[PDB]
Amino acid sequence: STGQHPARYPGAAAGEPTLDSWQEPPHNRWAFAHLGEMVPSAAVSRRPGHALARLGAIAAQLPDLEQRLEQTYTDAFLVLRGTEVVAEYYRAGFAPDDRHLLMAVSKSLCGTVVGALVDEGRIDPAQPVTEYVPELAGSVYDGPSVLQVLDMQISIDYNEDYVDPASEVQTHDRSAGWRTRRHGDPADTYEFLTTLRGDGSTGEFQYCSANTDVLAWIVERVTGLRYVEALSTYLWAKLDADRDATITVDTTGFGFANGGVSCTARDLARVGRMMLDGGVAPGGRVVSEDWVRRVLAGGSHEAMTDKGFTNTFPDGSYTRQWWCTGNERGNVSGIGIHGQNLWLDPLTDSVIVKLSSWPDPDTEHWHRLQNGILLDVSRALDAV
């Protein structure tokens, strides 16, 4: 049993509607207005072929930039300096206002929602996960604090290998609807999370996508809102965004908080703008000044033993669902596999969004190229 979850619509029974019941009353009133949440669906365009490159000023300092973006399978690229869009690129076939999967840049959005609730005093990061989700008793999340979930500092038997069909990654995906279910798989994400175990140790960084979905579960228990709605109420609706974001949902309607958000490059930049504005967005304060300061400050360096990350960023760390480079620029970034970055450059008051589709999820090869671009673009924004 995973306890109370937010109803898909007002008065809905647990788990309703399903793929087999959405045409029946009372579900169908909601379902007929939200069918994409139940059944895969395509856009039928209201609008009746070539890359768009407007690299602006940085083009002179980085003449080969477009080629470098092509080489890293760039779909959308945008640089916001202050409030101004100073460079843009979109591949052939991808429009400026098209949405793109964020993969784990989604986590940084989830952490932001958690931060909003901390500012309201509705979540205390020092409290155990079980203060908010008692049903996680007996699991690896029995004992650790919410902050340890936020900072990915819990040892878990979960192999975050994105190509291994035997990995917990795949089971997580199958439980949530990202892959085809197998017989005997957990019915939904909540159930999957309760199956997770570990040796009990904490304090060392271990990246685990399950952690973010636990955060989303906590958000639901504290607010009574579906995570989809909380993500709107506490973040997206305050951004003055051009378009809605989307998020994949599992069979209970639970949003795939760790990886499933899609949005436009320009709108994602608004999240970075909010961070560089001390937590304030056009629609109001999103998180506290202190929360943003802690993100920029980084997590414990000694917790960060990921050789992959520290080989590039020796003084790097991770906190509150953000990667912190600890470099001389103080760069911090949301990161998602296959080349997604929400990259903050506080020195120049700039945000870099890069949304990509590398053939591979995560290799040293792609990260070297991608980080080289992000750092070169950041430096190109320096006063000279």
* Domain extent listing, the chain: 25-48, 49-121+226-384, 122-225
Cis preceding linkage at 26, omega within 30:
yes
Instruction: Classify 102 as helix, strand or coil.
Output: coil
**CATH of span 122-225:** 1.20.58.710
Q: Of 232, 252, 235, which Cα lies nearest the Cα of 187?
A: 252
Asked if domains 49-121+226-384 and 122-225 share a fold, the reply is no
* Spatial distance between the Cα atoms of 329 and 361, rounded to a whole number of angstroms: 26
How far, in Å, CA of 89 to CA of 337, rounded? 20
Torsion over CA of 8, 209, 198 and 189, rounded to 10 degrees?
20
The architecture that CATH gives domain 25-48 is Helix non-globular (6.10)
For 49-121+226-384, the fitting CATH number among 3.40.710.10, 3.30.300.130, 3.30.428.10, 2.102.10.10 is 3.40.710.10
> Among 229, 245, 148, 227, which residue's Cα sits nearest to residue 190?
227
* CB contact set of 228 (below 8 Å; sequence gap of 6+): 247, 249, 253, 255
Check if the beta carbon of residue 227 is closer than 8 Å to that of residue 190.
no
225 contacts 6 by C-beta, under 8 angstroms: yes
